[PDB]
Design a protein around this ligand. Structure first.
Ligand code: A1IRY
Ligand SMILES: Nc1ncnc2c1ncn2[C@@H]1O[C@H](COP(=O)(O)OP(=O)(O)OP(=O)(O)O)[C@@H](O)[C@H]1O
Ligand SMILES: Nc1ncnc2c1ncn2[C@@H]1O[C@H](COP(=O)(O)OP(=O)(O)OP(=O)(O)O)[C@@H](O)[C@H]1O
Ligand SMILES: [Mg+2]
Ligand SMILES: [Mg+2]
Ligand SMILES: [Zn+2]
Lengths: 563, 559
């Protein structure tokens, strides 16, 4: 429950206190109503049955009050569950774009997906479905044992002693199937990630004959998931038996003391008959707690995943902003070092790029030229050194100002599953229709609109899989060009385009009217014609730089690169 | 179509119903014995009879508990095994549907199908029949017993029962449409979450969290959940209040105390009602809560059986080596939207065919048609003279290997990714294939070597993963090889080295190459220009340059 209170909105604590007060009041009303039968039946079986009117009046009041405290407790529990749901999902949605890219391991990616997947009604109704009956069931036999002290002290103590074994069974039950429930969750999440991989990588798996369950990775995950689920069913047997034995032990103490008092004469025969009914009410929570024990464990796993996302390490950020508004900034690396894990990517890369000029980065595969663009855009941050935009360190920039400074065309373009126009409008959702058509015209997406039957309303698939490789690449170019940012990072934006589209796109990047500091990565000579400067990056070091014609005449790596 | 799906569980479900009838009767018997024990207590009976009745009631409570536990365990095992077999069936079905199914569905839809629908069947095939039989048997038996005991105090028990039935009916009617809409919302939310996680760089550069479609869909889904679960939970709590043992006890006493106080009822006659009249409310609440689960299970069964009935790439039984032949092939991703228009081509062993053309002309879809990811709308495709529809997946993909345009790596070691088409291949073969693809050195530089995992985050550069897929195809070692835009992310040096390795390894093989870089396919035996889904000119490099057609224009644009 402490983890839940950690996740409650700070402006919702008034309802939690009110919920906790009414939850206790509901338990006491239920316990008092059960014990009111003992005076009621003793009076009813006596020589003056009219004396039961007083105890029936108090039962009506306790019964009516219980209805009101239970409807209100359900209303507050519904609000608390959905209030907690909205904050956690909104918090995770806001935090995840700021989480460091290294956090997104396959395990953490699976955890984040499953944490987001808990938006359904199961987590929203957590308070009404789990806490309210679990607290009501756990405290009712304790409350009945307290209310029986007013009927008979040794009777209440025997009832209370049966609650010590109830909490003992509750405490120990989770530890009996802790390991099995953990392995079941791991194999279940692993099976989820293989299904998504199965659907995404369907084409490559079919060619490899790794698509049938007897040969696929998802088939192996299904077998492991099934075996873990069957193990969980068997290892939950001690938990349910333990709650049953607690109820059996509780019954003997309650019934044994009631029989002992009645034989002693301290307890009347009608009172003992009324205590059978109280004993049934006293043992109902023992069965209810057993039913809620499996639900308590899955909830604890769910909240751990949500807390894992909220504990994810965010990127360093500041409050600075660029001085000029819309002017092309200068890009410079000041002894920037970067490493993925222990492997060094960049080693002392230093350069300066003039404002409003096009620069080309070329070199072998794996040299580090995609990492350089990510550092400029702020997707990654240097291990040491400092990337500066117009003399301002990027790590000190406002996140709102940092994203507004750079528009990126990524090496592997990713469109969102919607229409083609919506993917272009991601660059600038408030852009006018003239700006959107200008961006699509520049990126040669206007060819697609007439070529395709639906035009820009063409429903793109997951990623951009319902478009060809060069068609979704041009859509990602139109997205970047639509954004009015003063820095453009082009990461092989004509890799999947023919020569006719390569030439038109390359001219379009230069022909963009607004000023930008453009950095272009390409493996084609014809894609860097309009670059004012070139950076030959090899093994994370700028081996040489200068003009395109100058480097060709130098006969260095740049000349041999295109030989 | 839940009956057809759940037919294999015909006998377990009937057994569950009859055994649950027996179990609820055994659970009601202790309270009849306790009523008799109370009657003997008021009569001052000898201690022997009281001990016998008490011990019998306690033993029957224990028996009922152990029998219910055993039945739940057995039925949950039955449900688990059914879910496992059904998931195996679903994976086998999806293994041979057209790829257009996957493209138009998405990964979230597939995950919801294989996992969420099979889990939604759980209540239907594990709890629905037991809950129904318990809620039918226990109230009927108890009410018959209590009407025999006293009809006046038995009639008042119909008030909570009728109120509960009205609440249950209105709750089910109100929540049916929202339950129908729920899986669509879950699928959409899963798709948005998957896109949000996969497209994180696009989110970070463009818009961030605030301007993300994920947050808008999240708000809409939470609004739908609130509108669904608020009246539903209100009705649920009212039903819980109506059927609670306290409510039955209170209304029993309100009916009986005026009777007992007057000379209208002996108090002993209230012993049944206090001991049996408060037993069957929870069993009624079980079905009241389970109606929604039954509805969700029925819809999930309908969806699962709809997918299991889907048309697939059926292998015909109709029933030069190394030859591929497309004969008047046409293809349509969507009906009425042609993308391949009467394409005739022949790839022969010992030759290289370079399929070039404008972006979006249909090169990748033609390659996928050769792979039989989709069936040709018209014409035919033959391999070694055998129509690909007559070949099984093993027969087809042992003859033709593919390097797709998108470098898809599976979660696993680099050796697993290179050995995807032959997981039993030895390490020496994997190393040679990696060397041929100019990727062995990079894998050597990795910390774990060839065991380094290729999941999220621990990725490679684009050229490196493209080379890994090229090594995969090299290790497959098929007589026919297709290379869709291979070496597009490769630098000229790596491109030259891997192309030399491919030429060495496929001298006597059939090779199809798709390349926007026309300077790398001038040596091809045949060059096919595909424009607007049709072949516009075929020839060698010099012949196509002399022709002055689309190839000449693309070549001039490339220089
Ligand atoms: C399946 C489903 C479907 C249907 C159809 C088919 C059928 C099949 C058949 C099967 C059968 C099985 C059965 C078994 C059992 C029997 C019956 C019961 C019998 C019985 O129960 Fe008794 O016990 C038990 C176990 N026990 C065991 O184990 C043994 C030992 C330990 O025992 C003894 O000796 C002792 C004494 C007393 C008498 C006997 N008793 O009692 N005891 C004991 O301990 C006691 C203590 O407390 C109790 C109680 C209390 C409260 C409440 C309840 C009860 O009760 N108690 C069982 C389980 C459950 C549980 N419990 O509980
Ligand atoms: N997510 C990652 N985890 C680990 N290493 C990575 C990751 N991304 C890239 N690398 C490594 O970083 C080095 C440089 O990667 P980068 O993406 O900058 O390459 P590149 O120069 O753009 O290559 P290419 O020309 O092939 O696209 C390579 O060794 C690559 O293996
Ligand atoms: N899954 C799909 N659903 C619908 N249309 C599709 C799908 N995949 C591709 N297309 C359409 O098929 C047409 C041809 O695309 P294809 O990928 O076959 O061409 P391509 O020559 O390989 O292209 P590129 O050179 O850009 O990679 C394009 O108009 C694309 O819109
Ligand atoms: Mg790169
Ligand atoms: Mg393509
Ligand atoms: Zn269950």
């Amino acid at each position: 429950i402490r983890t839940l209170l950690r996740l409650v909105p700070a402006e919702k604590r008034g309802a939690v206190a009110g919920y906790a007060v009414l939850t206790l009041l509901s338990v006491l009303l239920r316990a008092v109503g059960a014990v009111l039968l003992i005076p009621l039946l003793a009076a009813l079986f006596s020589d003056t049955p009219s004396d039961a009117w007083l105890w029936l009046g108090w039962l009506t009041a306790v019964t009516l009050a219980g209805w009101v405290t239970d409807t209100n407790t359900a209303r507050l529990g519904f609000d608390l569950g959905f209030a907690v749901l909205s904050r956690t999902q909104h918090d995770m949605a806001d935090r995840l774009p700021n989480v460091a890219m290294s956090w997104f391991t396959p395990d953490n990616t699976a955890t984040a997906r499953q944490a987001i997947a808990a938006t359904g009604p199961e987590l929203a109704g957590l308070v009404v479905n789990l806490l309210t009956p679990l607290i009501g069931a756990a405290l009712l036999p304790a409350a009945i044992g307290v209310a029986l002290l007013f009927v008979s002290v040794p009777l209440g103590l025997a009832a209370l002693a049966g609650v010590a074994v109830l909490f003992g069974a509750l405490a120990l039950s989770g530890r009996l199937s802790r390991a099995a429930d953990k392995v079941a969750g791991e194999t279940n999440s692993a099976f989820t990630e293989r299904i998504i991989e199965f659907a995404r990588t369907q084409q490559a798996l079919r060619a490899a004959r790794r698509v049938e369950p007897a040969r696929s990775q998802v088939g192996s995950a299904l077998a492991a998931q099934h075996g873990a689920g069957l193990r969980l069913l068997t290892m939950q047997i001690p938990g349910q038996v333990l709650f049953s034995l607690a109820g059996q032990v509780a019954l003997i103490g309650f019934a044994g003391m009631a029989v002992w008092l009645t034989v002693r004469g301290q307890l009347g025969v009608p009172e003992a008959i009324a205590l059978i009914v109280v004993l049934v009410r006293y043992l109902e929570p023992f069965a209810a707690i057993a039913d809620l024990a499996p639900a308590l464990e899955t909830t604890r796993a769910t909240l751990n995943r949500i807390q894992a996302v909220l504990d994810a390490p965010t990127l360093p950020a500041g409050r600075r902003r660029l001085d000029r508004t819309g002017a092309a900034p200068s890009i410079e690396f000041d002894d920037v070092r970067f490493s993925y894990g222990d492997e060094v990517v960049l080693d002392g890369v230093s350069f300066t790029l003039r404002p409003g000029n096009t620069t080309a980065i070329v070199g072998p595969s794996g040299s580090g030229k995609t990492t350089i663009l990510s550092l400029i855009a702020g997707l990654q941050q240097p291990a040491s050194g400092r990337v500066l935009l117009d003399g301002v360190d990027v790590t000190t920039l406002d996140p709102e100002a940092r994203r507004a400074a750079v528009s990126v065309v990524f090496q592997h373009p990713y469109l969102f599953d919607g229409t083609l126009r919506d993917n272009v409008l991601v660059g600038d959702p408030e852009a006018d229709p003239d700006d959107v058509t200008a961006a699509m015209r520049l990126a040669r997406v206007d060819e697609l609109l007439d070529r395709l039957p639906d035009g820009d309303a063409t429903v793109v698939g997951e990623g951009g899989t319902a478009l060809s490789g060069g068609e979704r690449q041009r859509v990602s170019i139109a997205r970047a060009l639509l954004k009015p940012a003063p820095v453009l990072l082009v990461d092989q934006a004509t890799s999947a385009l023919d020569n006719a589209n390569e030439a038109a796109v390359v001219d379009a990047l230069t022909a963009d009217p607004r000023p930008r500091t453009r950095v272009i990565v390409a493996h084609r000579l014809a894609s860097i014609r309009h670059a004012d400067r070139v950076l030959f990056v090899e093994a994370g070091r700028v081996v040489e730089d200068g003009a395109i014609d100058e480097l060709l005449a130098a006969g260095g790596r740049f000349a041999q690169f295109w030989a | 179509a839940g009956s057809r799906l759940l037919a294999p569980l015909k006998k377990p479900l009937i057994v569950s119903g009859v055994l649950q009838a027996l179990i609820t009767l055994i659970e009601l018997a202790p309270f009849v014995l306790l009523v008799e024990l109370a009657r003997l207590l008021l009569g001052g009976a000898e201690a022997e009879r009281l001990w016998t009745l008490g011990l019998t009631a306690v033993s029957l409570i224990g028996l009922g508990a152990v029998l219910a536990a055993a039945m739940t365990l057995w039925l949950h095992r039955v449900d688990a095994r059914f879910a496992h077999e059904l998931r195996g069936r679903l994976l086998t079905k999806l293994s041979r549907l057209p790829l257009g199914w996957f493209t138009r569905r998405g990964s979230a839809s597939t995950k919801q199908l294989v996992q969420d629908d099979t889990l939604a069947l759980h209540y239907l095939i594990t709890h629905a029949i037991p809950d129904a039989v318990a809620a039918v048997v226990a109230p009927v038996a108890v009410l018959v017993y209590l009407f025999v005991a006293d009809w006046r105090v038995a009639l008042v028990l119909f008030i909570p029962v009728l109120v509960y039935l009205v609440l249950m009916s209105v709750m089910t009617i109100q929540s049916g449409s929202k339950i129908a809409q729920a899986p669509r919302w879950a699928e959409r939310m899963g798709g948005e979450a998957g896109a949000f996680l996969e497209g994180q760089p696009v989110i970070r550069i463009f818009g961030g969290a605030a301007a993300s479609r994920f947050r808008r869909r999240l708000d809409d889904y939470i609004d739908f959940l609130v509108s669904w679960q608020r009246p539903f939970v209100g009705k649920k709590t009212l039903m819980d209040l109506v059927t609670r043992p306290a409510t039955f006890l209170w209304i029993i006493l309100v009916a009986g105390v005026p009777l007992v106080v007057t000379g209208r009822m002996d108090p002993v006659n209230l012993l049944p009602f206090l001991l049996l009249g408060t037993t069957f409310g929870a069993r009624l609440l079980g079905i009241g809560y389970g109606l929604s689960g039954i509805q969700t299970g029925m819809l999930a069964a309908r969806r699962i059986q709809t997918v299991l009935d889907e048309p697939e790439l059926v292998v015909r039984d109709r029933t030069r080596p190394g030859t591929v032949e497309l004969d008047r092939v046409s293809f349509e991703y969507r009906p009425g939207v042609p993308v391949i228009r009467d394409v005739t081509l022949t790839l022969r062993p010992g030759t290289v065919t370079a399929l070039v053309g404008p972006s979006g002309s249909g090169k990748s879809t033609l390659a996928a048609l050769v792979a039989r990811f989709h069936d040709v709308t018209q014409g035919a495709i033959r391999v070694d003279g055998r129509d690909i529809r007559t070949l099984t997946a093993d027969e087809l993909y042992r003859r033709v290997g593919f390097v797709l345009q998108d470098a898809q790596l599976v979660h696993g070691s680099v050796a697993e990714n290179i050995a995807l088409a032959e997981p039993d291949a030895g390490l020496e073969r994997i190393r040679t294939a990696a060397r041929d693809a100019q990727i062995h050195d990079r894998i050597t530089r990795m910390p774990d070597g060839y065991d380094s995992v290729l999941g999220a985050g621990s990725a490679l550069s684009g050229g490196e993963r493209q080379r890994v897929t090229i090594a995969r195809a090299i290790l497959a070692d098929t007589p026919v090889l297709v290379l869709d835009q291979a070496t597009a992310f490769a630098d000229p040096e790596s491109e030259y080295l891997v192309q030399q390795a491919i030429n060495r390894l496929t001298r006597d093989r059939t090779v199809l190459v798709i390349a926007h870089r026309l300077h790398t396919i001038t040596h091809a035996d045949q060059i096919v220009v595909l424009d607007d889904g049709r072949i516009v000119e075929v020839g060698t490099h010099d012949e196509l340059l002399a022709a002055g057609g689309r190839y000449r224009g693309l070549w001039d644009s490339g220089r």
